[PDB]
Write a protein that binds this ligand. Structure first.
Ligand code: NAG
Ligand code: NAG
Ligand code: NAG
Lengths: 48, 48, 48
């Protein structure tokens, strides 16, 4: 919970009155997207 | 002006693997945060 | 266009632990409708 995260940052079991900056937050990704060209064939590199 | 810096985003960014081995450098960012917090608080004391 | 996912710091407003254990959480530079829609568990739970 938010209170415990303050204790760990302060390295103490008591918290004085005030406002403390604990961590940063980030929006997690929704999913994954792959966009690649739509041409599809076989490359004649085996002949080499 | 009072500014804040997010260490993880600035150095690595959106590379998850980069952040993981970044912790091996220790508590470098913690010192940076405390220094900048001290500057920001003093700016309000100046105006007071 | 490419716009990075929303991010920011997190700060916790608390009185003394002697006084109470209630806290308040401030999302720095986040519009209130842009907070992630966490129903049960979908983020990394940074200061839930
Ligand atoms: C690839 O996309 C183009 C659109 O620029 C379309 O004309 C073509 O038919 C597509 N081919 C395949 C195999 O999807
Ligand atoms: C070349 O020939 C060998 C057999 O001699 C075959 O295994 C291999 O797949 C061939 N390479 C190609 C078709 O690209
Ligand atoms: C915050 O909420 C939504 C997000 O775009 C928007 O409609 C509203 O105008 C925003 N207000 C401010 C002050 O950012």
């Amino acid at each position: 919970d938010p209170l415990s995260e303050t204790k760990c940052t302060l390295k103490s079991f008591t918290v004085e009155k005030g406002i403390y900056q604990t961590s940063n937050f980030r929006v997690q990704p929704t999913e994954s997207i792959v966009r690649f060209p739509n041409i599809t064939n076989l490359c004649p590199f085996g002949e080499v | 002006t009072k500014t804040s810096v997010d260490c993880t985003m600035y150095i690595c960014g959106d590379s998850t693997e980069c952040s993981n081995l970044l912790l091996q450098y220790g508590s470098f960012c913690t010192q940076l945060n405390r220094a900048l917090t001290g500057i920001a608080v003093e700016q309000d004391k100046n105006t007071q | 266009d490419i716009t990075p996912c929303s991010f920011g710091g997190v700060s916790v407003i608390t009185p003394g632990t002697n006084t109470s254990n209630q806290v308040a959480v401030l999302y720095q530079d986040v519009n209130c409708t842009e907070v992630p829609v966490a129903i049960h568990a979908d983020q990394l739970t940074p200061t839930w």
